[PDB]
Ligand binder design. Structure first.
Ligand SMILES: *[C@@H]1O[C@H](CO)[C@@H](O)[C@H](O)[C@H]1NC(C)=O
Ligand SMILES: *[C@@H]1O[C@H](CO)[C@@H](O)[C@H](O)[C@H]1NC(C)=O
Ligand SMILES: *[C@@H]1O[C@H](CO)[C@@H](O)[C@H](O)[C@H]1NC(C)=O
Ligand SMILES: *[C@@H]1O[C@H](CO)[C@@H](O)[C@H](O)[C@H]1NC(C)=O
Ligand SMILES: *[C@@H]1O[C@H](CO)[C@@H](O)[C@H](O)[C@H]1NC(C)=O
Ligand SMILES: *[C@@H]1O[C@H](CO)[C@@H](O)[C@H](O)[C@H]1NC(C)=O
Ligand SMILES: *[C@@H]1O[C@H](CO)[C@@H](O)[C@H](O)[C@H]1NC(C)=O
Ligand SMILES: *[C@@H]1O[C@H](CO)[C@@H](O)[C@H](O)[C@H]1NC(C)=O
Ligand SMILES: *[C@@H]1O[C@H](CO)[C@@H](O)[C@H](O)[C@H]1NC(C)=O
Ligand SMILES: *[C@@H]1O[C@H](CO)[C@@H](O)[C@H](O)[C@H]1NC(C)=O
Ligand SMILES: *[C@@H]1O[C@H](CO)[C@@H](O)[C@H](O)[C@H]1NC(C)=O
Ligand SMILES: *[C@@H]1O[C@H](CO)[C@@H](O)[C@H](O)[C@H]1NC(C)=O
Ligand SMILES: *[C@@H]1O[C@H](CO)[C@@H](O)[C@H](O)[C@H]1NC(C)=O
Ligand SMILES: *[C@@H]1O[C@H](CO)[C@@H](O)[C@H](O)[C@H]1NC(C)=O
Ligand SMILES: *[C@@H]1O[C@H](CO)[C@@H](O)[C@H](O)[C@H]1NC(C)=O
Ligand SMILES: *[C@@H]1O[C@H](CO)[C@@H](O)[C@H](O)[C@H]1NC(C)=O
Ligand SMILES: *[C@@H]1O[C@H](CO)[C@@H](O)[C@H](O)[C@H]1NC(C)=O
Ligand SMILES: *[C@@H]1O[C@H](CO)[C@@H](O)[C@H](O)[C@H]1NC(C)=O
Ligand SMILES: *[C@H]1O[C@H](CO)[C@@H](O)[C@H](O)[C@H]1NC(C)=O
Ligand SMILES: *[C@H]1O[C@H](CO)[C@@H](O)[C@H](O)[C@H]1NC(C)=O
Ligand SMILES: *[C@H]1O[C@H](CO)[C@@H](O)[C@H](O)[C@H]1NC(C)=O
Ligand SMILES: *[C@H]1O[C@H](CO)[C@@H](O)[C@H](O)[C@H]1NC(C)=O
Ligand SMILES: *[C@H]1O[C@H](CO)[C@@H](O)[C@H](O)[C@H]1NC(C)=O
Ligand SMILES: *[C@H]1O[C@H](CO)[C@@H](O)[C@H](O)[C@H]1NC(C)=O
Ligand SMILES: *[C@H]1O[C@H](CO)[C@@H](O)[C@H](O)[C@H]1NC(C)=O
Ligand SMILES: *[C@H]1O[C@H](CO)[C@@H](O)[C@H](O)[C@H]1NC(C)=O
Ligand SMILES: *[C@H]1O[C@H](CO)[C@@H](O)[C@H](O)[C@H]1NC(C)=O
Ligand SMILES: *[C@H]1O[C@H](CO)[C@@H](O)[C@H](O)[C@H]1NC(C)=O
Ligand SMILES: *[C@H]1O[C@H](CO)[C@@H](O)[C@H](O)[C@H]1NC(C)=O
Ligand SMILES: *[C@H]1O[C@H](CO)[C@@H](O)[C@H](O)[C@H]1NC(C)=O
Ligand SMILES: [Ca+2]
Ligand SMILES: [Ca+2]
Ligand SMILES: [Ca+2]
Ligand SMILES: [Ca+2]
Ligand SMILES: [Ca+2]
Ligand SMILES: [Ca+2]
Ligand SMILES: [Ca+2]
Ligand SMILES: [Ca+2]
Ligand SMILES: [Ca+2]
Ligand SMILES: [Ca+2]
Ligand SMILES: [Ca+2]
Ligand SMILES: [Ca+2]
Ligand SMILES: [Ca+2]
Ligand SMILES: [Ca+2]
Ligand SMILES: [Ca+2]
Ligand SMILES: [Ca+2]
Ligand SMILES: [Ca+2]
Ligand SMILES: [Ca+2]
Ligand SMILES: [Ca+2]
Ligand SMILES: [Ca+2]
Ligand SMILES: [Ca+2]
Ligand SMILES: [Ca+2]
Ligand SMILES: [Ca+2]
Ligand SMILES: [Ca+2]
Lengths: 540, 540
């Protein structure tokens, strides 16, 4: 058909109501009276009564103002019946479009936006982002397009133009330079959005930016030069602690100190760090020792764990140390294999005039010499002059003496001012003299009767050679009660044989030898005889 | 709206009734049950029940056959109410048109049409006009248009195609030739009219034509030659009547005869016409007279009053007349101043031998002569010979005779066969003779005594001159008793005087005269005298 165009109507209209929109006519009215009515939402349906028609003229009206924001369009159905009561025309659809008007102010997405950036970054860096909206049209008008802006950053210091915002997108960026968490950490700037691309109505928001941290700062010592005293030897011990103040953020690696000495003399120092006021705690690496050095001039520089965000001054601490003195024990010089001395020494004679030395050249402390180790008592010391003399009777020949030795240990004490011990061994070579003289091996026989065979006997000397070289056998009172002497060819033994057919048991034979001579006297080597033929038998 | 088209329905429909026309639906039926009804003429209004609707389906039906001729259209109103009882749709107008069907035969305007035309007219002449009608449509179909025609003229003689009719208009015209009122005056022809321009149904009428009259005919005499007898003189009189027969229409000028003679001899004839059988009535114009003519051959032609509608033969009647004779009176020839005759005629002498003449030469009829007029008896006639003689004594001298005349009239009579008179005057010159003689004037005197003066006396003669010429006086016995005679110079008188002194009265004197002589004797002229002197005095 020839339909009927949609009807545009403005919003928030205002004048004298009613307002005729249009007029409709059924031509089938030649016959009876026609009754015009109309139906739909806004008509008889909810919102009832916005539009109504004059049953007799065919006029359509808007009865009151409208807000497209509420309902932006309506569709209606129109009718025409006869007085008799019958419909005449197939109904007719009707449309109305509600044209937008700038009745709406915009509104920010949130009531407050927050942001953060680091202090050391470069100009032209994107920080935050902000939103807002207008409910009016924005597809055929500007009643709903906004334009963003900024008008007041607080801390109007260092300067007041650190940022800008993209008018269309509302994004903010760092424009200037001079950000420092250490002086001004959080800005609060006021934003506004406007109707018709900055032309219409405006509103406010608030965005707040916190500033991350940077290693803008270096560490600073609170003393620059310290001093402490120290002892030579127990040690590995705490000398002095140090103080400092970095200014970036505390629990952070831009706040933790790292040290080191420049030069470690004997490399006898270690230094650690501590999460207190991360003071510098210095200590001794390997004890000290001395009388060698009293002075210690060393320097320690301090850094952070992480590198610096800028060239900065490295700052050292210069420190002086002094070693207190402890006084140590003295010592005999050697451990003496000294005196190759003979057995004939006169009880009270100079053996070893000895001396001991003591470390501490503070030496105005003497000591006393004491002896100590010990198989039995011979020797003697002058305690205030360390003089070892030889008292007593010695005898290389016999008991304690093991290999050609006699080892003895002695002491010495550090007095004068405190304490001390000195353990020193002393081996002294004893010597030989020909003391003893020759002696027979077996002392009792068992001779036989009829024809006894030679009674083997031998010789032994306690002395050391030559002193036991060859012999000379001799028979004293009974050199004839019949007894005849004899030597083995290979030196050592002697052959003892009677020369008479003598008696039934129990009787001695006086013996007498010599080796350089010395002559011993020996003696009786008794002789038990019991009935027989010729071989030395078990007796009775 | 989207209305609803008119519904065409045929007429005189026929099949199984009902017949669904259309179905209607209210869409507002989602809510309750809707009740369909319908109203109007043909519905609930007169013709009630032609159409009805099914309250529950919405079907509309035609219940029975229809005739557009009765009602050619219907308009209806449809309704729809809810069960609860409320109307839902404004009613709806409904229309039905009833399409025509050839159910109607045509019909003539009148039951019989009449007409008339004159016999002598020319082919291609409009006569009558005829009408008729069909009641079916004639504006979209041919169910109502007719075509006219003819199929039977009676008097299928002279020929049978004297006319035609205009098929579309129904007008009739003369097509042929030969119309004669005189033989066939009234035709009766049958006409027909037809459906669909001569295609559908047909009917009959009747038209009757009478034929006016024309002067097709001339007049015809019934005798062709007549005869009649006639008398000379009373006259102006009816000779003979004539018969004829024209054949056109009687009371009409195409039936009235007009005559005339060809040649009117002395122009003594008139002829009129008469509304009887309009015979020719001939008569005498001015008496006749004769003995001059006996024969009359004349001719009379006859026409009509109005000219002829065609060349025709003029027909004459030839007629013969004969004049009977009447015999008239005779006549003396003149009226005579004849006879200068003298007074001395001898009683019985020829004066006037006269004759008279009579007209009719049939003359074997004589007459008798009689006299008639009259102062006294002298003359005489021979009656059978007309001879006037003179008997008697005449005398020019005296009484009847006036101027020198004597007039007399006489007669004569026509006998022999019938009657007659003849009046003729007659003057006859009488003559003079000297009869008488002289005579004295006074006859008695009165003379005087002493001295009487002359007594005058005179003379007179009865005669005519010379006969009275001069005198001669004479005195007889007393020529002396004293008396002396005398004449006047101028002739006539005489002087009478005595010569004696004589006596006293009473006495005569004898006188005597003459004129040729004749001599009279006169006489006594007495004389009375009485006393005196000299003048003739009165006496005593
Ligand atoms: C930003 O927020 C802080 C915290 O309240 C406030 O003290 C300061 O004034 C605001 N503006 C700037 C530029 O710091
Ligand atoms: C020396 O060392 C001591 C240790 O107690 C310290 O207090 C002092 O500051 C250092 N410097 C000097 C000059 O004494
Ligand atoms: C670190 O020590 C310096 C030296 O006096 C001082 O100026 C600074 O304020 C100290 N740091 C802090 C946080 O006080
Ligand atoms: C202190 O500094 C030294 C030198 O680098 C390092 O080895 C040590 O681990 C530090 N102490 C601590 C607790 O970090
Ligand atoms: C530390 O060493 C420096 C370098 O010679 C010296 O001046 C100072 O006296 C020493 N000790 C102290 C107490 O500073
Ligand atoms: C000698 O030195 C040895 C080796 O230590 C030791 O066993 C002995 O007791 C010391 N004295 C003597 C008499 O041998
Ligand atoms: C010296 O050392 C000895 C070891 O034999 C010890 O018993 C003694 O206590 C020490 N003397 C002193 C004075 O400290
Ligand atoms: C020295 O004396 C000390 C103290 O008893 C002892 O421990 C040590 O064994 C002794 N000997 C030596 C050779 O120092
Ligand atoms: C040997 O025997 C004798 C005889 O009785 C006796 O006197 C002596 O003591 C014994 N031994 C020695 C070595 O004299
Ligand atoms: C016409 O009418 C006359 C009068 O009745 C009738 O006699 C005649 O037959 C009809 N037809 C004609 C052609 O004369
Ligand atoms: C003569 O006249 C008479 C008159 O009576 C008439 O009857 C007759 O027809 C006429 N013709 C002849 C030849 O007689
Ligand atoms: C007129 O006279 C003629 C002559 O005989 C005749 O033929 C005719 O019929 C007459 N007219 C009439 C109407 O009779
Ligand atoms: C008869 O004919 C004569 C000749 O024309 C005419 O004068 C006369 O009037 C006619 N008579 C009648 C009655 O028409
Ligand atoms: C009439 O006149 C004609 C013409 O001569 C003649 O023949 C006839 O006899 C006359 N009279 C009669 C009686 O016809
Ligand atoms: C003569 O004629 C006259 C004239 O008519 C007449 O009067 C008279 O009577 C006649 N007779 C005589 C005698 O005169
Ligand atoms: C002749 O005429 C006379 C006139 O005087 C008349 O009296 C008479 O009757 C007539 N005679 C005859 C015979 O008719
Ligand atoms: C002749 O006679 C007739 C008949 O009386 C008369 O009338 C007439 O006057 C007479 N006279 C003449 C001259 O005819
Ligand atoms: C005249 O008189 C005389 C005398 O008496 C007488 O006789 C006579 O008659 C008279 N007259 C005449 C004419 O005679
Ligand atoms: C010093 O002592 C600390 C503590 O035991 C140890 O971990 C470190 O290895 C030593 N040396 C250094 C150079 O720090
Ligand atoms: C000082 O030395 C440190 C390393 O010990 C270094 O990191 C720092 O950058 C140096 N100072 C300068 C100004 O370069
Ligand atoms: C510490 O002090 C000493 C002496 O003044 C100097 O040699 C050393 O360089 C100093 N360290 C610093 C960082 O100044
Ligand atoms: C530490 O500081 C001293 C004095 O200020 C300087 O001479 C030395 O070079 C510095 N040490 C380092 C490693 O930077
Ligand atoms: C004594 O000192 C010596 C060094 O000559 C050593 O060999 C020996 O073991 C020491 N003996 C003791 C008990 O100290
Ligand atoms: C005695 O001398 C030997 C050889 O020098 C030596 O090796 C040994 O240790 C010493 N003492 C002993 C009991 O062998
Ligand atoms: C003849 O007589 C009639 C009748 O009086 C008259 O009217 C007519 O004029 C006369 N003459 C003619 C020629 O008809
Ligand atoms: C004969 O004469 C009449 C007039 O008297 C005339 O009207 C008629 O036409 C004539 N006949 C013919 C054939 O012309
Ligand atoms: C009448 O008859 C006479 C004689 O036959 C003739 O001369 C005349 O012409 C006739 N008239 C007619 C019309 O024939
Ligand atoms: C009348 O008829 C006669 C004879 O038929 C004819 O000779 C004559 O010419 C006719 N007269 C007229 C006037 O036609
Ligand atoms: C007689 O006839 C004559 C003709 O001469 C005439 O003059 C006169 O009048 C007539 N008299 C009478 C009485 O007829
Ligand atoms: C006599 O004659 C005269 C003259 O002719 C004439 O005129 C007269 O009529 C006659 N009669 C009379 C009485 O005069
Ligand atoms: Ca709004
Ligand atoms: Ca809006
Ligand atoms: Ca807006
Ligand atoms: Ca900074
Ligand atoms: Ca730092
Ligand atoms: Ca920082
Ligand atoms: Ca030391
Ligand atoms: Ca020391
Ligand atoms: Ca010491
Ligand atoms: Ca010894
Ligand atoms: Ca020895
Ligand atoms: Ca020896
Ligand atoms: Ca019909
Ligand atoms: Ca029809
Ligand atoms: Ca029809
Ligand atoms: Ca005719
Ligand atoms: Ca005629
Ligand atoms: Ca006719
Ligand atoms: Ca005559
Ligand atoms: Ca006659
Ligand atoms: Ca006669
Ligand atoms: Ca006479
Ligand atoms: Ca005479
Ligand atoms: Ca005379």
């Amino acid at each position: 058909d020839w339909v009927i165009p949609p009807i545009k109507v403005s919003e928030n209209e205002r004048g004298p109501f009613p307002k005729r929109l249009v007029q409709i006519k059924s031509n089938k009215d030649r016959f009876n009276k026609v009754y015009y009515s109309i139906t739909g939402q806004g008509a008889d349906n909810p919102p009832q009564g916005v539009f109504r028609i004059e049953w007799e003229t065919g006029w359509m009206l808007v009865t009151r103002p409208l807000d497209r924001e509420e309902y932006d369009k309506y569709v209606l159905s129109s009718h025409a019946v006869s007085e008799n009561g019958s419909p005449v025309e197939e109904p007719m659809e009707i449309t109305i479009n509600v044209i937008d008007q700038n009745d709406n102010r915009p509104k920010f997405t949130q009531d407050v936006f927050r942001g953060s950036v680091r202090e050391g970054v470069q100009p032209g860096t994107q920080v935050m982002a902000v939103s807002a909206t207008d409910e009016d049209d924005n597809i055929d008008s500007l009643n709903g397009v906004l334009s963003y802006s900024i008008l007041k950053q607080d801390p109007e210091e260092p300067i007041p133009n650190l940022f800008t915002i993209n008018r269309e997108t509302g994004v903010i960026s760092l424009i200037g330079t001079g950000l420092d968490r250490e002086k001004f950490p959080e800005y609060t700037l006021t934003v506004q959005a406007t109707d018709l691309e900055g032309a219409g109505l405006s509103v406010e928001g608030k965005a707040i930016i916190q500033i991350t941290d940077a290693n803008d700062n270096a560490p600073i010592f609170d003393p620059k030069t310290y001093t402490a005293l120290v002892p030579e030897n127990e040690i590995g011990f705490e000398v002095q602690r140090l103080s400092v103040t970095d200014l970036d953020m505390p629990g952070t690696p831009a706040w933790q100190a790292v040290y080191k000495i420049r030069v470690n003399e004997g490399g006898f120092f270690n230094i650690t760090t501590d999460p207190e006021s991360n003071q510098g705690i210095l200590t001794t690496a390997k004890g000290l020792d001395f009388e060698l050095r009293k002075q210690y001039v060393l320097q320690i520089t301090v850094e952070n764990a992480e590198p610096f965000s800028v060239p900065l001054p490295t700052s050292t601490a210069t420190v002086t140390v002094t070693v207190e003195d402890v006084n140590e024990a003295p010592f005999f010089v050697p451990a003496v294999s000294r005196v190759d001395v003979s057995e004939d020494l006169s009880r009270g004679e100079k053996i070893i005039s000895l001396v001991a030395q003591d470390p501490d050249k503070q030496q105005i402390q003497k000591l006393s010499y004491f002896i100590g180790n010990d198989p039995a008592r011979w020797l003697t010391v002058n305690k205030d002059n360390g003089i070892v003399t030889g008292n007593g009777n010695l005898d290389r020949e016999s008991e304690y003496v093991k290999n050609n030795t006699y080892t003895v240990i002695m002491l010495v004490t550090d007095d004068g001012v405190s304490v001390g011990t000195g353990t020193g061994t002393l081996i002294l070579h004893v010597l030989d003299v020909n003391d003893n003289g020759p002696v027979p091996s077996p002392r009792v026989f068992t001779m036989c009767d009829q024809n006894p065979e030679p009674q083997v006997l031998t010789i032994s000397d306690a002395d050391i050679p030559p002193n036991t070289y060859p012999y000379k056998v001799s028979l004293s009172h009974g050199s004839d009660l019949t007894w005849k002497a004899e030597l083995d060819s290979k030196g050592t033994s002697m052959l003892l044989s009677p020369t008479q057919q003598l008696k039934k048991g129990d009787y001695s034979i006086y013996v007498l030898l010599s080796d350089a001579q010395n002559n011993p006297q020996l003696t009786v080597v008794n002789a038990t005889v019991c009935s027989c033929e010729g071989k030395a038998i078990k007796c009775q």
